[PDB]
């Protein structure tokens, strides 16, 4: 009965289940709060990729979270997390969540 | 083919059919990445609080879902402009979505 | 805030006590649940299940008045946990009514 909350790092199991890290099982940073995520079954989340090539909307994850890489803030997307069997991975520190929000807010014209 | 979506544009986008979407990200980003942040138009208004109505004179059938924003490859989906949303529509979409995102 | 009703919970609902039949795995996804009202015994209620004492509310569960409803809009709030035999008896009476 897990409900993702904002700041959670979660595993999302997209349709190519086979192939492990070569398949669709992706980590992501949740931006929307549980009070929305649990009602709608949807969430606003940004994908985490293992490799950073220095683009301006990347947000690097600090070490020892249990997942490594960069949050791609410009690829934030509304998605159905219930069908993708979301599972909690870690909690992002507040400064990562504030930096992702600042970058996405700038991209969205807020 | 010269067209680059800009913030506030309403565009048709393909999917596999086509549907309209409201572009939120600026052409400066959209043109160099080939991606954009856009919110879909849905034909069924239900009174959901993240629905945003468009002025009728725009000729769009439906309402924008402000919380359904996502990154889209507008080149491969063949974006084409159909209208431009007024600034107060953009302000309402961004105000509702920013509220949800914790801004 | 976090609360999702589970099968066998007694809950308060706006429109007030109700017994939840459907499990949380359904209830949390849909925002709906199957539940039966709690009221006082009456001759005209042939499918009643009496509640034990000390559950915060007394009375009978009306097994034949079970219905689908949206519990999120009704601000469902937990009241207690009914014993397994109350839930089993409600299910037994409702199942017979439904032709199962």
């Amino acid at each position: 009965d897990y409900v993702p909350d904002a700041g959670h790092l979660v595993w999302l199991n997209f349709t190519p289940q086979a192939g492990h890290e070569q398949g669709g099982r992706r980590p992501a940073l949740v931006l929307s709060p549980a009070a929305y995520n649990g009602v709608t079954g949807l969430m606003q989340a940004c994908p985490v990729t293992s490799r950073a090539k220095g683009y301006p909307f990347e947000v690097t994850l600090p070490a020892h979270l249990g997942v490594s890489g960069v949050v791609l803030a410009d690829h934030c997307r509304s998605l159905d997390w219930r069908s993708r069997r979301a599972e909690q991975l870690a909690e992002a520190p507040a400064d990562v969540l504030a930096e992702v929000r600042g970058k996405l807010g700038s991209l969205l014209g807020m | 083919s010269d067209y680059v979506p800009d913030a506030g544009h309403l565009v048709w986008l393909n999917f596999t059919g086509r549907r309209p979407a409201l572009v939120l990200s600026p052409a400066a980003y959209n043109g160099v990445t080939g991606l954009m942040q856009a919110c879909p138009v849905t034909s069924r208004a239900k009174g959901y609080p993240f629905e945003v109505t468009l002025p009728a004179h725009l000729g769009v059938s439906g309402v924008v879902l402000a919380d359904h924003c996502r990154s889209l490859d507008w080149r491969s989906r063949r974006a084409e402009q159909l209208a431009e949303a007024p600034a107060d529509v953009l302000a309402e979409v961004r105000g509702k979505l920013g509220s949800l995102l914790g801004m | 805030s976090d609360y999702v009703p589970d099968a066998g919970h007694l809950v308060w609902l706006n429109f007030r006590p109700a017994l939840v039949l459907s499990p949380a795995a359904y209830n949390g996804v849909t925002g709906l649940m199957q539940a039966c009202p709690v009221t006082s015994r009456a001759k005209g209620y042939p499918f009643e299940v009496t509640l034990p004492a000390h559950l915060g509310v007394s009375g009978v569960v009306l097994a034949d008045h079970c219905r689908s409803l949206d519990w999120r809009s009704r601000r469902a709030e937990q009241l207690a946990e009914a014993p397994a035999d109350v839930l089993a008896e409600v299910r037994g009476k409702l199942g017979s009514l439904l032709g199962m």
Partner: peptide, 30 residues
Amino acid sequence: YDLAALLAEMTPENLHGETDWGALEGREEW
């Protein structure tokens, strides 16, 4: 906008599921 005002207006009767954009296309990451 007050988020609590917005979220309190959501009900199971007015939700919209994930928009269908079909399969991933072009440079989309997911």
